[PDB]
Each structure stands twice: as C-alpha cells, then as structure tokens.
Design a protein around this ligand. Structure first.
Ligand SMILES: Cc1[nH]c(-c2csc(N=C(N)N)n2)c2c1C(=O)CC(C)(C)C2
Length: 126
C-alpha cells in the first residue's frame, strides 16, 4: 500500500496574511489542542501503511491533521481564519466518517472538538 502526498503547507503563489484571528488560532486554539492527552492520533497525517488501513484514503479524499495545520499557521499559509477553521472541521469530520460512534478515536476527536469550540467562541474581532 501507499500513502498519498500530504497536504501542502507552502505554496508561494497563494496570497498570505497574518491577522489577529490567525494569531489566536495558533497561540490559543492549536496550542490548546496540541498539548491535550488525546492529540497524538491527530498530530500528523494518517499513516495508512503502518496502520494497515489500505481503505483509509479510498474513503477520505480530503485528509487533514493538526501537524499540517500547525505548519500552515507557522508558515502563514492562510489568508483568513475561516480557511483554518475549515481545516480543523475537516479533520474532525474525516474521523467521524471513517470510524464508528463510540470508537476510542471518535471519543478523542469529540474531546478535542469540544475544546476547539470553546476557544473559537472567543475568537477576537478582526
Ligand atoms: C485520525 C487517526 N489517527 C490514527 C492513528 C493510529 S496510530 C497513530 N499514530 C500517530 N503517531 N498519529 N495515529 C487513526 C486515525 C483514524 O481515524 C482511524 C484509526 C483509529 C484506525 C487510526
């Protein structure tokens, strides 16, 4: 089996910005989720080879993970906060699509998503 190329974290002809909201997404949102006890399945792209999940990238066609998000934020890849919020939501949705209610990985995603929502609720005005 083979893994796909990971999502890009740099693209020189994509216009970039730093906004106060994107700074909050790195310094508050990403940092809070990244340090959580349940972060570790989400800190890098799913390695379908090592996990023996040959169907993962047959089912998940828009993969996303916090390692990618972290690099995108550190590289100022985004134009706006909504792009980054969408990446987080894609990561969570992929987990719920591939897995089953009650699976450990789903409980982990749910805990991280609760914290994500608590922090996003306090996103500063631009
Ligand atoms: C988002 C995600 N991550 C991992 C995983 C397993 S082992 C490991 N190791 C790291 N160092 N991240 N990550 C998985 C997953 C799934 O949705 C499906 C699954 C639970 C079968 C396996």
């Amino acid at each position: 089996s083979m893994n796909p190329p990971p999502p890009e974290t740099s693209n020189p002809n994509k216009p970039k910005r730093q906004t106060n909201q994107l700074q909050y997404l790195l310094r508050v949102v990403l940092k809070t989720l990244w340090k959580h006890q349940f972060a570790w399945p989400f800190q890098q792209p799913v390695d379908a080879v090592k996990l023996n999940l040959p169907d993962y990238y047959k089912i998940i066609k828009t993969p996303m993970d916090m390692g990618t998000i972290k690099k995108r934020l550190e590289n100022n890849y985004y134009w706006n906060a909504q792009e980054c919020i969408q990446d987080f939501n894609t990561m969570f949705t992929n987990c719920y699509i591939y897995n089953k209610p009650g699976d450990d990985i789903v409980l982990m995603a749910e805990a991280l998503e609760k914290l994500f929502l608590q922090k996003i609720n306090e996103l500063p005005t631009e």
